[PDB]
Amino acid sequence: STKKTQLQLEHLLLDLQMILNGINNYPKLTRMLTFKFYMPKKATELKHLQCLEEELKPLEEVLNLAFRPRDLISNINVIVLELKETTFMCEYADETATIVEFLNRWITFCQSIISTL
Ligand SMILES: CC(C)C[C@@H](NC(=N)N)C(=O)NCC(=O)N1CCC(c2cc(-c3ccc(OCc4ccc(C(=O)O)o4)c(Cl)c3Cl)nn2C)CC1
């Protein structure tokens, strides 16, 4: 059970990393930063993945406007939902962020959980 959680988080880490790498390869990059995302106040536990889940449709939107995007987010949606049974109301920070800041924060979040086992 613990190994399946570690490999799920690693798969989530790769997918977010795959998006961020393609974003840096793009004038076009400046236009992609106008798209704003809601961010968590503090992401420490696995329960906070509800903040990412809520922002997956907005993530699909920006990838469509730029990158199949519908197939990629569908895979992320399953993994996130499988990783988090518990109803947790998510808390969003006062400041919104760009696509680059959104991805990097969740990449760092994923790297924190893998380290805590
Ligand atoms: C209040 C806000 C936090 C709520 C938020 N929802 C949420 N995250 N929960 C939301 O709705 N945000 C959406 C948003 O921020 N938008 C503003 C930007 C909009 C937008 C961007 C582009 C867009 C256009 C063009 C683009 O690039 C193509 C291109 C080709 C070449 C060049 C160039 O030379 O610059 O530009 C790209 Cl990457 C994008 Cl993202 N199209 N539109 C309408 C979408 C809505």
UniProtKB/Swiss-Prot annotation:
Cellular compartments per GO CC: extracellular region; extracellular space
Disulfide bonds: C51-C90
Single biological process term from Gene Ontology: positive regulation of cell population proliferation
Keyword match Acyltransferase: no
Location of the protein in the cell: Secreted
Assigned keywords, A-Z: Adaptive immunity, Chromosomal rearrangement, Cytokine, Disulfide bond, Glycoprotein, Growth factor, Immunity, Pharmaceutical, Proto-oncogene, Secreted, Signal
Keyword Glycoprotein attached: yes
Any GO molecular function: glycosphingolipid binding
UniProt family annotation: Belongs to the IL-2 family.
Function of the protein: Cytokine produced by activated CD4-positive helper T-cells and to a lesser extend activated CD8-positive T-cells and natural killer (NK) cells that plays pivotal roles in the immune response and tolerance. Binds to a receptor complex composed of either the high-affinity trimeric IL-2R (IL2RA/CD25, IL2RB/CD122 and IL2RG/CD132) or the low-affinity dimeric IL-2R (IL2RB and IL2RG). Interaction with the receptor leads to oligomerization and conformation changes in the IL-2R subunits resulting in downstream signaling starting with phosphorylation of JAK1 and JAK3.
Noted disease: A chromosomal aberration involving IL2 is found in a form of T-cell acute lymphoblastic leukemia (T-ALL). Translocation t(4;16)(q26;p13) with involves TNFRSF17.
Name of the protein described by the UniProt record: Interleukin-2
Organism of derivation: Homo sapiens (Human)
Lineage: Eukaryota, Metazoa, Chordata, Craniata, Vertebrata
Portion of the full sequence shown: 26 to 152 of 153
